[PDB]
Design a protein around this ligand. Structure first.
Ligand SMILES: [K+]
Ligand SMILES: [K+]
Ligand SMILES: [K+]
Ligand SMILES: [K+]
Ligand SMILES: [K+]
Ligand SMILES: [K+]
Ligand SMILES: [K+]
Ligand SMILES: [K+]
Ligand SMILES: [K+]
Ligand SMILES: [K+]
Ligand SMILES: [K+]
Ligand SMILES: [K+]
Ligand SMILES: [K+]
Ligand SMILES: [K+]
Ligand SMILES: [K+]
Ligand SMILES: [K+]
Ligand SMILES: [K+]
Ligand SMILES: [K+]
Ligand SMILES: [K+]
Ligand SMILES: [K+]
Ligand SMILES: [K+]
Ligand SMILES: [K+]
Ligand SMILES: [K+]
Ligand SMILES: [K+]
Ligand SMILES: [K+]
Ligand SMILES: [K+]
Ligand SMILES: [K+]
Ligand SMILES: [K+]
Ligand SMILES: [K+]
Ligand SMILES: [K+]
Ligand SMILES: [K+]
Ligand SMILES: [K+]
Ligand SMILES: [K+]
Ligand SMILES: [K+]
Ligand SMILES: [K+]
Ligand SMILES: [K+]
Ligand SMILES: [K+]
Ligand SMILES: [K+]
Ligand SMILES: [K+]
Ligand SMILES: [K+]
Ligand SMILES: [K+]
Ligand SMILES: [K+]
Ligand SMILES: [K+]
Ligand SMILES: [K+]
Ligand SMILES: [K+]
Ligand SMILES: [K+]
Ligand SMILES: [K+]
Ligand SMILES: [K+]
Ligand SMILES: [K+]
Ligand SMILES: [K+]
Ligand SMILES: [K+]
Ligand SMILES: [Mg+2]
Ligand SMILES: [Mg+2]
Ligand SMILES: [Mg+2]
Ligand SMILES: [Mg+2]
Ligand SMILES: [Mg+2]
Ligand SMILES: [Mg+2]
Ligand SMILES: [Mg+2]
Ligand SMILES: [Mg+2]
Ligand SMILES: [Mg+2]
Ligand SMILES: [Mg+2]
Ligand SMILES: [Mg+2]
Ligand SMILES: [Mg+2]
Ligand SMILES: [Mg+2]
Ligand SMILES: [Mg+2]
Ligand SMILES: [Mg+2]
Ligand SMILES: [Mg+2]
Ligand SMILES: [Mg+2]
Ligand SMILES: [Mg+2]
Ligand SMILES: [Mg+2]
Ligand SMILES: [Mg+2]
Ligand SMILES: [Mg+2]
Ligand SMILES: [Mg+2]
Ligand SMILES: [Mg+2]
Ligand SMILES: [Mg+2]
Ligand SMILES: [Mg+2]
Ligand SMILES: [Mg+2]
Ligand SMILES: [Mg+2]
Length: 245
RNA sequence: GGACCCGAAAGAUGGUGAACUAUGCCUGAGCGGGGCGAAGCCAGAGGAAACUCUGGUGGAGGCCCGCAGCGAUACUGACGUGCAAAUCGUUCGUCUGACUUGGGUAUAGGGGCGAAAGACUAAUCGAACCGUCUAGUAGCUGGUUCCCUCCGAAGUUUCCCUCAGGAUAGCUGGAGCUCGCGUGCGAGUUCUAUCGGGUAAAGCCAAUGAUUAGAGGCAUCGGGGGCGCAACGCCCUCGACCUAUUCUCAAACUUUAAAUAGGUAGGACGGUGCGGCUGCUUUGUUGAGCCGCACCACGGAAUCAAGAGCUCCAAGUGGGCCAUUUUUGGUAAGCAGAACUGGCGAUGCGGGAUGAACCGGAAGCCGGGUUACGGUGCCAAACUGCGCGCUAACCUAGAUCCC
RNA sequence: GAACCGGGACGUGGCGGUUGACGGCAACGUUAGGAAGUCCGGAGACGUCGGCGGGGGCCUCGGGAAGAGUUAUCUUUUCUGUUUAACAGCCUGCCCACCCUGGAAACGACUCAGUCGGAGGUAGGGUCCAGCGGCUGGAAGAGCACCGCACGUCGCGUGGUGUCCGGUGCGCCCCCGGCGGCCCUUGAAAAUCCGGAGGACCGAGUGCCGUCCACGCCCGGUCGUACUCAUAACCGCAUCAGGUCUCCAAGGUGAACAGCCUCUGGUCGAUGGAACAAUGUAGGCAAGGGAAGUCGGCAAAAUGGAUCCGUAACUUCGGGAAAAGGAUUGGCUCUGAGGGCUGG
RNA sequence: GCCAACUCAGAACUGGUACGGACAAGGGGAAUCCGACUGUUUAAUUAAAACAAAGCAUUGCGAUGGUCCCUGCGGAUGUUUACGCAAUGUGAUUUCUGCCCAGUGCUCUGAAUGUCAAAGUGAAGAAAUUCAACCAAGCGCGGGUAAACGGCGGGAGUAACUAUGACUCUCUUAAGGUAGCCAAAUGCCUCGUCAUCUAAUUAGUGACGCGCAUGAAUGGAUUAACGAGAUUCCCACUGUCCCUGUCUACUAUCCAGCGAAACCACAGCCAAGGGAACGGGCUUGGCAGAAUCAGCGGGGAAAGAAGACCCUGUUGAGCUUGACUCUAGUCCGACUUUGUGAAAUGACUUGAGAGGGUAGUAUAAGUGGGAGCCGGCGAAAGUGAAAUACCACUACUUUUAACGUUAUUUUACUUAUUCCGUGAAUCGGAAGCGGGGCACUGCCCCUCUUUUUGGACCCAAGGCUUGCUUGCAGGCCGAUCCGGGCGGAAGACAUUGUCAGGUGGGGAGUUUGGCUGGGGCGGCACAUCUGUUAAAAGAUAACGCAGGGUCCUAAGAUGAGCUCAACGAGAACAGAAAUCUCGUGUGGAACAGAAGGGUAAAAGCUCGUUUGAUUCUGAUUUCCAGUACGAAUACGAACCGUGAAAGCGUGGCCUAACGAUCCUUUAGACCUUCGGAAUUCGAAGCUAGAGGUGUCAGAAAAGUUACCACAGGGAUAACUGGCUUGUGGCAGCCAAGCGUUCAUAGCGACGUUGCUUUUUGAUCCUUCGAUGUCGGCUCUUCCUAUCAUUGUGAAGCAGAAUUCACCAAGUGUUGGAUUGUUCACCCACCAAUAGGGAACGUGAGCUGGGUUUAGACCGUCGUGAGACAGGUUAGUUUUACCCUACUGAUGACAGUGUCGCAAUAGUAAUUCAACCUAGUACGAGAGGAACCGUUGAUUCGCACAAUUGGUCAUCGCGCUUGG
């Protein structure tokens, strides 16, 4: 008869993201004439740590195409990039790690990161540390490029979508064991109030379908309907299978 | 309808709280002295080499003892109308981190928040607090205010999600009305005459069923012994069978069959003789009812009759209990359940020492007389009255229905 | 009494015109020493822990002088105080950072720990940075201590002496510097201020144009400000043994803001008196036995600091571990070892 | 030479061996269980094994998305992007994680139309409307899934002693407990069996295992280190105890001052009696003497609270789901938003064409004339059930356009709509400057200027041309022209809105009968019949006794004929039992069913004819209120059956076999109404049946609560008390037998009479506005049904020992292991280690180990919430100052004092050992007493401190730490 924790998540106010010390969103430059037709050069000034994000970020300074001022950008760092490096963004940019190129100019089998979904969206795919997308094939008839995403899915995107050459830096982070609750506490303190987690079978019936019983047990199948209403949809949602492979 | 008065656990609606506590966020602050001695580094020794070893340096850890801080294990200590609606004393856990803490800020009631105890959300939490709907509804508990006088119950029937309730009939009050004065439309009573019964008892030597014992007979058709190869051959024992007897039995057996109790009748609403009506009935004014006229009818058994009949409105009651006799279950019960009557309940009074039911007896306020039951050695009113026997208790002799 | 900040306006003097200073090889220095739209950088501006070093205050030892305490005996001894603010100038120049000469293995330099060097070490010579560093002015005239004269009811009167010279440190509080450890944690923003890139535009010859320089002049609103901050000034119905954030922090013992005693400061506020029955509450002891008590060793007792010797099974090899088990500990009189500065 | 600090290590000397001198400050060891550890938690009874945790595993999701919030609009995750976010389970490391997809879930690019709404389409009708096809998701079917919920049994045969079963086959239901582990925090029996630990062990440890009911991420096994966690043992230690004593402070005490509260019908001495079954009051007795002080915990069934346990109410509430009825969300179809075009494919139109036999070649598929048809067939018959010849139309399978209908797909456009990016900064076309080839003057093919470097980059130089002569100012190129789309993506799909179907404990509301020797479980005594209880009219109770929702066109109606069961005697197979003959035959047969009645030319059996099992209403009986229903009975008014007729028949031979209102539906009338008038559909009326309420005078209805609540109930359970005494315990009587013979020394079978309330039952009288619920500890008293001790009788009593019995309750009846234990069982001592009451004595006397709140684990059960007579661990014990009682203390008792008497009340002593008797009596031996006397001792009681021991704040003396 009580709202469950998963339900309470949506209202927020204690489950909102912790973003006080973050350095702003990481994204490509806004797509413009220079990147569409030629190439534009910037310089990497700093490599910084973004709290709550495994991958390091890169500060890049560009010369504004048509204004007398500096254009400052924050890119998701690719492995191998260093301070003082020159980054080239555009259709005519060379195929080097750290450069941002339109997928139409990236040959097949290339490893890229921060791939745009819609032309000009400034990058939404393969942004986490150690992750990357792979260019599979091109279709000039409809101007569409096929990519393999980190999850293994194959997606078709417009060939004008941009992507940075190389993989995201910081790979191998999840290999290290944490060994203690304090490390997880520190990890999630800068992410959100999602830790520690209380098991449903440890609660009373009033606040969870798994609660109750003189023994600790679910008492009914943990697989639930895809259309099960909020508050009832707990456990393995719409599972096509369970158990070991 | 507030509905005689007071009372629920709840439900609904609209508002108020994160000054406590829970969690996230922002910005500040706080945490002796010791122990162990990880990486990294320096030097030396052994060895053919590989490599091994030793002594220093350094200071890691959700590491250890421990002060402050934070918390609260045991005494199940103190106190337990306390210093205190959670405190005090000793003891105890942790103490550089998942650490402690101030202020600001966010989350508000079927909502929040929860390292999860249904915990916390202002001494309020398995749904906060404040006002209102609201005099919420209660077959349930408690109260329900002057006097005398008259009458005066019920715990039983049927129906009800009915079993602590209600309606219904019965019991009761009030109002009367119709008549009547012994010629009485009557009666919890007898008498006379007529009917029904299957209990008590009795019966099995009567049907059905149960059951003991012997006696006399019988078989080409029972088990054995003897005489025998067998024999429908012979002699005996026990069994069946027949006959006449015999012990003992029945709520769901019975021929017979009480006591008590049940029904009907004993005139004025009768009888007799004529005539009439019918569409009913008959072969038949043959019957069956009914209707007119004439005559007779001493009231047609006893006793009593503080009279008989009729109607309307309505209260309370619908938990009963006890006793002689009859009687079911139960070892029995101050157990549980039925029949008739009476009693207590609703009722005092004398007796049984004492007592709701036993015995007596029922009652306005008094004087006198006499009794009922029970008593007359004292307590305590009335004889140590007149008489006959029994008992002698070295066990507390014995001493009055229920008891 | 002596300073500072912000704002306003001018006057005097100074500074530049090679229109927009000079010096240094350089780091950079000097009180001044153009400039508009536009653009760029820095400060503000940041976690935590450990060692080391510097500064201020405190603590502490010795000497000089002033006063006081003790003095049956000893005590050149015991006690108190012996001060220097903001601000201005000059000097100095921690640890770092930076610059010039030069070119290094037989490698050297170097910290407690690290670390650094042909991407230029050692060495020689310099620049800059901090300071809560030094001297001077402020400022001895002030404050403090001591010794005198005077009114002796009301002179907040009047005068003198001193305020000096050294040592020491794993000491305590605060600030700072520079390294190192930790993170799947990397530990605010803005107002505001400073600097820089560019040079449109701008002036004269005995006066003009500028000037962040020196001195002089004027002004600076509104509200809070007492007191308590707690065993009686807040909350708990109270003058309630509870609860309520934080700053300062002496001496002795001792590892120690442990316990105990003491100095400054505070305080004797818990209604008082008499007696010392039982039963209680709190705190001890108890011959012999030693858990037989009790559901149960509940409670209490025992052990305990430091130094030396020594330490098993098991083990995730990190521990177990202070395992277990033994010895010592006072006072007094000595001995030895462990340092700094100066001088060829 | 001048200064400087406290660290370390040694050596003498020395004190009453004192010296971390106060203070400060681990007890240790050997094991088992749980949880890895650090951390967190029920503020005010539970700190834990519970929660979290790192590690492990599973699930969804690529943004047009997953999860979630929101009335709506829009939002959180998201300053994000799979090394991520979201939803779960397990719980370090090590090792392992077996079989089962039948069930419930979840899931799928699977077959298919078995079912499937609204809208839309077609037929009929005057229309309302009814019929058909088409028909989404979902459901059904199929597949996959167990680190999803969960499950892991039984049977038969089989090895050469037996036993088991490697092996083979089978059933429910998919499989049949694998590796492991165990009387476990998990085992009932159970205190299981064995070993060990102890003197003794329901405890601990190890082992065994058909294990009521162990078992593998509902995780199994182990595990160093850790723990205010649960357990066992050992060492040290001790006032826990033997067994108490003593010391200090503060109280209590007394005083000055000050000064409440709880509670109070009236009050307060007892024994018994009865009584509402436990009185302070009543009855009968005992007694009983002013006024006061300090305690005390027996009583006041003391106070504290309208019992929280249990039951009842037509009272809730938290939670759950396979309960009833709904609902947010979600999926799906239609219409709308919604505009502009082109093609395929499947049906329906018509239109031409091909095919078929169960047995036979064959359309003989179906039909008519065929005797005649266009050389060909019948005209003959082989199958035959029905003819081939010439005509079509009828059914089934099968191709394709002229016209038209319908449905599903593919695809085109962008302006509606939706989404993305930007400070809407170069978008579309063309042309020029340059670079390539061709062959010859034109073509086509490409580019927009920036890639060794951690620099800077803006506000136009230049050329041409005007005002007039420039303070300077105005135009073009530099800087191509033209496009009145900021740049893209999806796109009439998505999205909004309205209806329609599915899903929907996420959420709302509600329900979850009654009787009942408490309630539940059980049963139905709830409608209802027979016999009996039932007491010879009727009526009559119990969860008394023994039993009983249909069936029949005949098993109803009528007429006729006959007589059944059984027995006796006879007849081949044939007999106990087949069919047949005669005789007897009162029903001993049959009549649907339970039982009781009833019936013989019948009510039974056979046969003939039949539908009175018919229509119409009234009356009566049974039940009973003299209501209804059911059932039955006697007439009346009709039509019939049967019989010759009287007559009989209104269902079953009689006594049971059944059902209101509302609604639905059927039958009846030339019936009534639709209210402005007519006709016709439709609807509504009247009369009689049918669909049913079995809780049967008739709601529509699942659990749980230990998180719990309210109104009440002693109308009703869980103690004591009261009745009873079956059961338990303790006695008696008779005498068949036992006892070498002998019933009775000692016993007592078969029977039979009693007593007791320390057993357990039975009951429900008292108590539910509360009488504190086990056991132990302490303390007193009482009983005898006597264990020991004193005195006796009897013996199958030689002695010793033992047994039976009589006076007898004066005295005593113990220390320990295991268990919470009562109980039990062992060890030990002893004269003995008897049995019991006192509200199952005794909690304002204690304790709190157990039972019996809330936390938590295991096993079994349940889908679940949760349950458990199963186990386990942690879990607040309140108040006396009132009256009485009792213990002591003043006082009263007629001046004061001393010495005394004395009723009455209380009372106290107990048991054992040794020596001698005595190796005596007795006895064949073995063995083996007792009186007297002497010396000690046990338990208990009253005193006392010479000695010993204890006690210190003599604060007495000494020593000593820090200040
Ligand atoms: K809710
Ligand atoms: K959290
Ligand atoms: K968890
Ligand atoms: K559950
Ligand atoms: K579980
Ligand atoms: K009324
Ligand atoms: K607050
Ligand atoms: K904070
Ligand atoms: K609420
Ligand atoms: K009632
Ligand atoms: K008879
Ligand atoms: K008979
Ligand atoms: K009534
Ligand atoms: K800050
Ligand atoms: K640091
Ligand atoms: K200042
Ligand atoms: K400038
Ligand atoms: K002030
Ligand atoms: K203050
Ligand atoms: K013990
Ligand atoms: K025990
Ligand atoms: K810790
Ligand atoms: K812990
Ligand atoms: K704890
Ligand atoms: K846990
Ligand atoms: K989303
Ligand atoms: K799981
Ligand atoms: K399955
Ligand atoms: K399945
Ligand atoms: K199976
Ligand atoms: K495991
Ligand atoms: K613990
Ligand atoms: K007083
Ligand atoms: K008496
Ligand atoms: K009720
Ligand atoms: K509740
Ligand atoms: K659409
Ligand atoms: K729906
Ligand atoms: K639901
Ligand atoms: K009939
Ligand atoms: K009923
Ligand atoms: K419920
Ligand atoms: K008995
Ligand atoms: K009772
Ligand atoms: K009670
Ligand atoms: K005991
Ligand atoms: K505890
Ligand atoms: K005298
Ligand atoms: K005496
Ligand atoms: K003495
Ligand atoms: K003494
Ligand atoms: Mg579990
Ligand atoms: Mg707050
Ligand atoms: Mg500790
Ligand atoms: Mg009534
Ligand atoms: Mg009778
Ligand atoms: Mg009488
Ligand atoms: Mg009289
Ligand atoms: Mg540290
Ligand atoms: Mg010092
Ligand atoms: Mg001076
Ligand atoms: Mg400049
Ligand atoms: Mg207040
Ligand atoms: Mg020291
Ligand atoms: Mg919306
Ligand atoms: Mg479908
Ligand atoms: Mg096995
Ligand atoms: Mg285990
Ligand atoms: Mg009595
Ligand atoms: Mg109550
Ligand atoms: Mg009722
Ligand atoms: Mg006949
Ligand atoms: Mg009906
Ligand atoms: Mg004899
Ligand atoms: Mg006796
Ligand atoms: Mg006795
Ligand atoms: Mg289960
Ligand atoms: Mg006496």
């Amino acid at each position: 008869g009580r709202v469950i924790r998963a339900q309470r998540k949506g209202a927020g106010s204690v489950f909102k993201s912790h973003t006080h010390h973050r350095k702003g969103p990481a994204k490509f430059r806004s797509l413009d004439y220079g990147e569409r037709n030629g190439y534009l050069k910037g310089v990497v000034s700093e490599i910084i740590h973004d709290p709550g994000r495994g991958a390091p970020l890169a500060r890049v300074t560009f010369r504004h195409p048509f204004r007398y001022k500096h254009q400052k950008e924050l890119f998701v760092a690719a492995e191998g990039m260093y301070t003082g490096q020159f980054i080239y963004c555009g259709k005519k940019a060379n195929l080097m790690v750290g450069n941002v190129l339109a997928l139409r100019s990236i040959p097949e089998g290339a490893v890229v990161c921060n791939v745009e979904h819609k032309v000009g969206d400034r990058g939404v795919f393969a942004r986490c540390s150690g992750d990357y997308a792979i260019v599979i094939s091109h279709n000039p008839d409809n101007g569409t490029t096929r990519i393999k995403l980190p999850s293994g899915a194959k997606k078709i995107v417009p060939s004008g979508c941009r992507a940075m050459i190389g993989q995201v830096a910081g790979g191998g982070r999840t290999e290290k064991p944490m060994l203690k609750a304090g490390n997880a506490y520190h990890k999630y303190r800068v992410k959100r109030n999602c830790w520690p987690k209380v098991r449903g079978v440890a609660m009373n019936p009033v606040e969870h379908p798994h609660g109750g019983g003189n023994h600790q047990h679910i008492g009914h199948a943990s697989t639930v309907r895809r259309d099960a209403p909020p508050g009832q949809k707990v456990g393995l949602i719409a599972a096509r299978r369970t158990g070991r492979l």
